[model samples]
Target: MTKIALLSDIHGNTTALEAVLADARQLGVDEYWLLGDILMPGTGRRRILDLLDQLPITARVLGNWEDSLWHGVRKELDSTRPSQRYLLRQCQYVLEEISLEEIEVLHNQPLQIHRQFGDLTVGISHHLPDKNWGRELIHTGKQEEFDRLVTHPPCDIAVYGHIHQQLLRYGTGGQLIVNPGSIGQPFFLDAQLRKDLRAQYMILEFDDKGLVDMDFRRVDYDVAAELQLAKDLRLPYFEVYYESLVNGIH
Candidate 1:
């Protein structure tokens, strides 16, 4: 079987990424595929990207946020709104933290990638193949919405990550759809109010027959430490970032 690790939305949380990598290492993933959002909000942009550079990444796609960083782009914000100010400031700060070489790496990444593993074909992207920045094809969205994403899927299996939620479903022609969730940010609806602060990823196995199976994995880490690191860095969106880190809400 060919085993591969799929990760996305790391968002510069080195702690969470480290924990997730360690967990995946224990399982011995053959290769890695990252779906973008590698930096932002978290202060460990440099560290996180550096660690990823050390990994065996076979495929990489640019997330919407990463697209902005790659071109030094930031959304216009109203000066009167502190929330907007903070958001813009955080985006700029993350850009400053990243080196020119790293920016080049982001620039070189494709919007989507397709590869073949034996008899199975796999595709990876930050979102839909046509609209990489869209938030429309979510888990609860209609099957037709999901089907639209892979209308002409580059491969037999379509894999994307943008909503920070884990999803496993099939599209038209029995084509598989997989979203590995987020490494730095994750969410799940539960009866209890407790927050789940864990890094999430996926493992997919393929063999001569076809795509065999996939496993969604979540790894717990020291949220407090990362929160404290955020505080120390004095990141602009401290409160919002802290709340999301603490309660998985933004």
Candidate 2:
């Protein structure tokens, strides 16, 4: 059995990311698929990238937040609300911490990736295959929303992360749609899931017949430590981060 580890939406909470990686290590992953949201809204930009550089990642895709950071460097986004301004400030700060070489590494990542291994094929992205920033494919999105996956899916198994929720279902032609959820900031409309406060991820095993086993794992981490780090860094919109860490409410 070929085992692959999948994680996403790690919005700069290195504390959570580290815990999730430690759990994945124990399980022994053959490959890693990271679905982006690597920086900002928290204070671990450089730290997270440093850790990822040392990992055995098979593929990585750009999340909307990553796009905002890249575009912020180029003076994109003409206007900003309070939230947008705060996020942009965070993006600018991260840019200062990273070198041009590192920025290129983020730029080099594709919005989507398609790879084949014998009878199994996987398509990965931060969100939907077509648009990186769209609400049509959210966690509880309608069937028509899921139909988009069927219309032009890139592989036999479509995997993405952005909604910060675990989803495993079949799209058209029985193709699997998998989401590992969020490592840093996981939330759900359901009150219980929203309050769980664990680093979320997924592990999948594939064989000739296709995805033979799937495990959606959530692991405990030092949320208080991460909250303290965010406070120390004096990140913008810090109250929101605190709430997310403490209650998973954001």
What does candidate 2's lDDT look like per residue over 101-146, in tens digits?
6766786678888878677778888887767777877866887666
lDDT (10s digit) by residue, model 1, range 1-250? 7788998998888789999999988998889999988887677777887788789999988788776565444345664787555556766777667666767777677887789877667778888775678667776777877776566654778899998888898887788899999999786665253366688899998878887778988899999899888888877678888878887776
Give the CA lDDT, 0 to 100, for residue 187 in model 1: 66
Task: Give me the runs in candidate 2 sitting further than 4 Å from their true place.
Answer: 77-80, 151-154
Give the TM-score comparing model 1 with the true structure, all chains together: 0.90
lDDT of every predicted structure (CA atoms): 0.79, 0.81
How far is each candidate from the true structure, as Cα RMSD in Å? 2.3, 1.8
Minimal lDDT window, size 10, model 2? 146-155
Residue 235 error, candidate 2, Å: 2.0
